[PDB]
Amino acid sequence: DDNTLYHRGFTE
Amino acid sequence: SFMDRKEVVNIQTWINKPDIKHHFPCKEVKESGHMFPSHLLVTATHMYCLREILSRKGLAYIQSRQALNSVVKITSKKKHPELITFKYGNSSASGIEILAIERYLIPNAGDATRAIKQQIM
Secondary structure (H helix, E strand, C coil): CEEEEEECCCCC | CCECCCEEEEHHHHHCCCCCCEEEEEEEECCCCCEEEEEEEECCCEEEEEEECCCCCCEEEEEEEEEHHHEEEEEEECCCCCEEEEEEEEECCCCEEEEEEEEEECCCHHHHHHHHHHHHC
16 A cells, blocks of 8 residues: 555646 | 667766756566666656666666656555655546556655656646
8 A cells, every 4th residue: 555645636 | 788688878877968857776676576776867858767787887778768747646655665656647637547657666765756756847
């Protein structure tokens, strides 16, 4: 299981 | 060499190129579990991965070259936070289209991803 560090469209 | 299996270049020569905004030692991780000492080289528009050629000091394969604009997700593992997965493809409201995935074990995971992320935006 993982941690989002960047997700185009969502984390900006 | 010009090609060993892929294109062979001189790691140092590349690090000093003007385009290069960042540079990060790491090891690519395969599903098989094998790991390959490499160097992620980040430009204003691309991210290269140079795979060190062990038997030839200071030389690397150009193992891949992705467009920052095609990065859609970057995750770190919880159990091992220096293991950074890169996910490439297309992203919209409805969801995500995954075309390629690269996994690197990166020494300064935090600094690295923050540098790449800053380029991406």
